[PDB]
Design an enzyme around this catalytic site. Structure first.
Site, PDB file in Angstrom:
ATOM      1  N   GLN A  20      34.366  -4.248   2.701  1.00 61.98           N
ATOM      2  CA  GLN A  20      35.244  -4.291   3.870  1.00 61.98           C
ATOM      3  C   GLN A  20      35.838  -2.933   4.252  1.00 61.98           C
ATOM      4  O   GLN A  20      36.166  -2.730   5.428  1.00 61.98           O
ATOM      5  CB  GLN A  20      36.384  -5.301   3.639  1.00 61.98           C
ATOM      6  CG  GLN A  20      37.397  -5.400   4.801  1.00 61.98           C
ATOM      7  CD  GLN A  20      38.364  -6.571   4.685  1.00 61.98           C
ATOM      8  OE1 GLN A  20      38.014  -7.634   4.164  1.00 61.98           O
ATOM      9  NE2 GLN A  20      39.583  -6.386   5.190  1.00 61.98           N
ATOM     10  N   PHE A  21      35.974  -1.995   3.306  1.00 63.37           N
ATOM     11  CA  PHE A  21      36.672  -0.734   3.550  1.00 63.37           C
ATOM     12  C   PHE A  21      35.764   0.481   3.581  1.00 63.37           C
ATOM     13  O   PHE A  21      36.174   1.517   4.107  1.00 63.37           O
ATOM     14  CB  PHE A  21      37.742  -0.477   2.474  1.00 63.37           C
ATOM     15  CG  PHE A  21      38.827  -1.517   2.399  1.00 63.37           C
ATOM     16  CD1 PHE A  21      38.702  -2.601   1.542  1.00 63.37           C
ATOM     17  CD2 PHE A  21      39.995  -1.375   3.136  1.00 63.37           C
ATOM     18  CE1 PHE A  21      39.704  -3.537   1.446  1.00 63.37           C
ATOM     19  CE2 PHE A  21      40.998  -2.313   3.050  1.00 63.37           C
ATOM     20  CZ  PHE A  21      40.856  -3.393   2.206  1.00 63.37           C
ATOM     21  N   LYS A  42      34.202   3.010  -5.023  1.00 61.73           N
ATOM     22  CA  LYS A  42      34.526   2.433  -3.727  1.00 61.73           C
ATOM     23  C   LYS A  42      35.227   3.483  -2.872  1.00 61.73           C
ATOM     24  O   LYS A  42      36.245   4.050  -3.279  1.00 61.73           O
ATOM     25  CB  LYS A  42      35.430   1.219  -3.896  1.00 61.73           C
ATOM     26  CG  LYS A  42      34.874   0.166  -4.794  1.00 61.73           C
ATOM     27  CD  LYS A  42      35.937  -0.831  -5.128  1.00 61.73           C
ATOM     28  CE  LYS A  42      36.436  -1.489  -3.877  1.00 61.73           C
ATOM     29  NZ  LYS A  42      37.540  -2.419  -4.189  1.00 61.73           N
ATOM     30  N   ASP A 134      35.750 -16.772  -5.607  1.00 62.39           N
ATOM     31  CA  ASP A 134      34.471 -16.230  -5.155  1.00 62.39           C
ATOM     32  C   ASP A 134      33.504 -16.054  -6.325  1.00 62.39           C
ATOM     33  O   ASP A 134      32.922 -14.991  -6.533  1.00 62.39           O
ATOM     34  CB  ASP A 134      34.710 -14.926  -4.400  1.00 62.39           C
ATOM     35  CG  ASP A 134      35.364 -15.158  -3.029  1.00 62.39           C
ATOM     36  OD1 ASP A 134      34.824 -15.969  -2.250  1.00 62.39           O
ATOM     37  OD2 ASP A 134      36.413 -14.538  -2.732  1.00 62.39           O
ATOM     38  N   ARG A 138      25.772 -13.673  -6.712  1.00 68.16           N
ATOM     39  CA  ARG A 138      25.784 -12.425  -5.945  1.00 68.16           C
ATOM     40  C   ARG A 138      26.901 -11.480  -6.374  1.00 68.16           C
ATOM     41  O   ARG A 138      26.831 -10.282  -6.082  1.00 68.16           O
ATOM     42  CB  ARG A 138      25.919 -12.718  -4.440  1.00 68.16           C
ATOM     43  CG  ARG A 138      27.364 -12.933  -3.944  1.00 68.16           C
ATOM     44  CD  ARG A 138      27.495 -13.109  -2.409  1.00 68.16           C
ATOM     45  NE  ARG A 138      27.534 -14.513  -1.969  1.00 68.16           N
ATOM     46  CZ  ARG A 138      28.646 -15.166  -1.645  1.00 68.16           C
ATOM     47  NH1 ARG A 138      29.829 -14.569  -1.723  1.00 68.16           N
ATOM     48  NH2 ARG A 138      28.576 -16.424  -1.251  1.00 68.16           N
ATOM     49  N   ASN A 139      27.922 -11.991  -7.062  1.00 70.81           N
ATOM     50  CA  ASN A 139      29.103 -11.231  -7.444  1.00 70.81           C
ATOM     51  C   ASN A 139      29.105 -10.846  -8.907  1.00 70.81           C
ATOM     52  O   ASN A 139      30.076 -10.239  -9.367  1.00 70.81           O
ATOM     53  CB  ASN A 139      30.383 -12.034  -7.144  1.00 70.81           C
ATOM     54  CG  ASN A 139      30.633 -12.197  -5.673  1.00 70.81           C
ATOM     55  OD1 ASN A 139      30.377 -11.275  -4.883  1.00 70.81           O
ATOM     56  ND2 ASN A 139      31.134 -13.371  -5.285  1.00 70.81           N
ATOM     57  N   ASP A 152      33.545  -6.403  -9.010  1.00 67.73           N
ATOM     58  CA  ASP A 152      34.857  -6.083  -8.475  1.00 67.73           C
ATOM     59  C   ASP A 152      35.359  -7.251  -7.648  1.00 67.73           C
ATOM     60  O   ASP A 152      34.675  -7.706  -6.724  1.00 67.73           O
ATOM     61  CB  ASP A 152      34.814  -4.815  -7.627  1.00 67.73           C
ATOM     62  CG  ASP A 152      36.166  -4.490  -7.033  1.00 67.73           C
ATOM     63  OD1 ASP A 152      37.064  -4.166  -7.833  1.00 67.73           O
ATOM     64  OD2 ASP A 152      36.347  -4.584  -5.791  1.00 67.73           O
TER      65      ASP A 152
HETATM   66  C1  LIG Z   1      24.089   2.183   0.191  1.00 65.91           C
HETATM   67  C2  LIG Z   1      23.249   1.437   1.208  1.00 65.91           C
HETATM   68  C3  LIG Z   1      22.564   0.151   0.718  1.00 65.91           C
HETATM   69  O1  LIG Z   1      21.851  -0.503   1.482  1.00 65.91           O
HETATM   70  N1  LIG Z   1      22.800  -0.193  -0.558  1.00 65.91           N
HETATM   71  C4  LIG Z   1      22.197  -1.397  -1.181  1.00 65.91           C
HETATM   72  C5  LIG Z   1      21.115  -0.957  -2.184  1.00 65.91           C
HETATM   73  N2  LIG Z   1      21.242   0.484  -2.493  1.00 65.91           N
HETATM   74  C6  LIG Z   1      21.141   0.731  -3.806  1.00 65.91           C
HETATM   75  C7  LIG Z   1      21.564   0.080  -4.974  1.00 65.91           C
HETATM   76  N3  LIG Z   1      22.262  -1.064  -5.199  1.00 65.91           N
HETATM   77  C8  LIG Z   1      22.142  -1.574  -6.578  1.00 65.91           C
HETATM   78  C9  LIG Z   1      23.277  -1.576  -7.435  1.00 65.91           C
HETATM   79  C10 LIG Z   1      24.397  -2.388  -7.239  1.00 65.91           C
HETATM   80  C11 LIG Z   1      25.467  -2.381  -8.138  1.00 65.91           C
HETATM   81  C12 LIG Z   1      25.431  -1.549  -9.264  1.00 65.91           C
HETATM   82  N4  LIG Z   1      26.380  -1.463 -10.212  1.00 65.91           N
HETATM   83  C13 LIG Z   1      27.689  -1.706 -10.026  1.00 65.91           C
HETATM   84  N5  LIG Z   1      28.476  -1.478 -11.081  1.00 65.91           N
HETATM   85  C14 LIG Z   1      29.853  -1.681 -10.982  1.00 65.91           C
HETATM   86  C15 LIG Z   1      30.386  -2.141  -9.783  1.00 65.91           C
HETATM   87 CL1  LIG Z   1      32.054  -2.437  -9.604  1.00 65.91          CL
HETATM   88  C16 LIG Z   1      29.550  -2.388  -8.718  1.00 65.91           C
HETATM   89  N6  LIG Z   1      30.159  -2.865  -7.608  1.00 65.91           N
HETATM   90  C17 LIG Z   1      29.420  -3.279  -6.562  1.00 65.91           C
HETATM   91  C18 LIG Z   1      28.493  -2.419  -5.968  1.00 65.91           C
HETATM   92  C19 LIG Z   1      27.736  -2.866  -4.885  1.00 65.91           C
HETATM   93  C20 LIG Z   1      27.902  -4.139  -4.369  1.00 65.91           C
HETATM   94  C21 LIG Z   1      28.831  -4.990  -4.942  1.00 65.91           C
HETATM   95  C22 LIG Z   1      29.595  -4.580  -6.035  1.00 65.91           C
HETATM   96  C23 LIG Z   1      30.475  -5.544  -6.527  1.00 65.91           C
HETATM   97  O2  LIG Z   1      31.461  -5.259  -7.184  1.00 65.91           O
HETATM   98  N7  LIG Z   1      30.140  -6.797  -6.237  1.00 65.91           N
HETATM   99  C24 LIG Z   1      31.050  -7.857  -6.724  1.00 65.91           C
HETATM  100  N8  LIG Z   1      28.231  -2.149  -8.870  1.00 65.91           N
HETATM  101  C25 LIG Z   1      24.311  -0.751  -9.468  1.00 65.91           C
HETATM  102  C26 LIG Z   1      23.261  -0.781  -8.558  1.00 65.91           C
HETATM  103  C27 LIG Z   1      20.994   1.123  -5.742  1.00 65.91           C
HETATM  104  O3  LIG Z   1      20.868   1.411  -6.941  1.00 65.91           O
HETATM  105  C28 LIG Z   1      20.580   1.761  -4.571  1.00 65.91           C
HETATM  106  O4  LIG Z   1      19.960   2.805  -4.337  1.00 65.91           O
END
Ligand SMILES: *CCC(=O)NCCNc1c(NCc2ccc(Nc3ncc(Cl)c(Nc4ccccc4C(=O)NC)n3)cc2)c(=O)c1=O
Length: 258
Positions: A20-21, A42, A134, A138-139, A152
């Site tokens: 969102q941010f 973030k 939630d 997906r989360n 997160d």
């Molecule tokens: C940037 C443009 C885009 O289209 N991105 C999507 C794919 N690009 C991409 C990825 N994504 C894979 C990915 C996702 C998450 C993580 N690790 C990770 N570790 C800790 C935290 Cl807190 C999060 N948070 C998070 C990140 C993304 C989405 C959602 C959350 C979350 O907290 N959901 C509850 N993520 C690693 C790799 C990749 O490697 C690319 O290149």
């Protein structure tokens, strides 16, 4: 202690998603004399304004409250614009994508492990009387082939196809309604990242659930596990297990399968 982080210790890397941010990046937090730590960052586009900034930073403060192996831990914040929230990296990414592509490489024992791990996290949050609202595959994030974590909480935020009936009809959100959500997530995992009610419209889900339709038994899911799920899907919230009961039952179901 002090969650304030010097920006010069952070090396921002590739984008890994959006919230969102702002965008979420992976990256590295460096510290004198100690190994580099992989982190997710973030970012916030509209942080210059004090009202957005206070909403953004409240998400770190929410994660600051918790300390559990299977929930992502907050590392620190940077408060000088642009404002950044630094979290631990789960370096294998999102659970669903992980499951689709690693299908032929995991066993049923691994999937039940994830469910057991998420249940410890959710019991923990139940003991803190915190309501997630939630839960969904997906989360969930992947820290290791044998370690998944709730992502997160702020990045997790209607998810009609996951929500309890009381959640949809009355906007009621309780630990019991979390138990329903968790059962849909548990189904998702035995299904290797398939979404519930694919092809069904959101406004019709509540009707199908009121009529008693329920997600079917996943191929190669033990009956005692599906039995467990259908109990999370009880229409009456009062008849849904508590997360502490789920953890104990999943622990037995894992022991047997391994
Ligand atoms: C940037 C443009 C885009 O289209 N991105 C999507 C794919 N690009 C991409 C990825 N994504 C894979 C990915 C996702 C998450 C993580 N690790 C990770 N570790 C800790 C935290 Cl807190 C999060 N948070 C998070 C990140 C993304 C989405 C959602 C959350 C979350 O907290 N959901 C509850 N993520 C690693 C790799 C990749 O490697 C690319 O290149």
């Amino acid at each position: 202690r002090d969650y304030e982080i010097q920006r010069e210790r952070i090396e921002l890397g590739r984008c890994i998603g959006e919230g969102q941010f702002g965008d979420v990046h992976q990256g590295i937090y460096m510290s004198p004399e100690n190994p580099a730590m992989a982190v997710a960052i973030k970012t916030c586009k509209n942080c210059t304004s004090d009202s957005v900034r206070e909403k953004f930073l409240q998400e770190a403060l929410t994660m600051r409250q918790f300390d559990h192996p299977h929930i992502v831990k907050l590392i620190g914040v940077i408060t000088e614009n642009p404002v950044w929230i630094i979290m631990e990296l789960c370096t294998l990414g999102e659970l669903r994508s992980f499951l689709q592509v690693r299908k032929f490489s995991l066993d049923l024992a691994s999937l039940i492990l994830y469910a057991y791990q998420l249940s410890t996290a959710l019991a923990y949050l139940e003991s803190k009387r915190f309501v997630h609202r939630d839960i969904a595959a997906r989360n969930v994030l992947v820290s290791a082939t044998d370690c998944v974590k709730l992502g997160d909480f702020g990045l997790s935020r209607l998810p009609i196809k996951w929500m309890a009936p009381e959640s949809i009809n009355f906007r009621r959100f309780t630990s019991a309604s979390d138990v329903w959500m968790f059962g849909v997530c548990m189904w998702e995992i035995l299904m290797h990242g398939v979404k519930p009610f694919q092809g069904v419209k959101n406004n019709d889900v509540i009707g199908r659930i009121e009529n008693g339709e329920r997600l079917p038994m996943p191929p190669n899911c033990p009956p005692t596990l599906y039995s467990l799920m259908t109990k999370c899907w009880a229409y009456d919230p009062s008849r849904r297990p508590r997360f502490t009961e789920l953890k104990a039952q999943l622990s037995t179901i894992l022991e047997e399968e391994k």
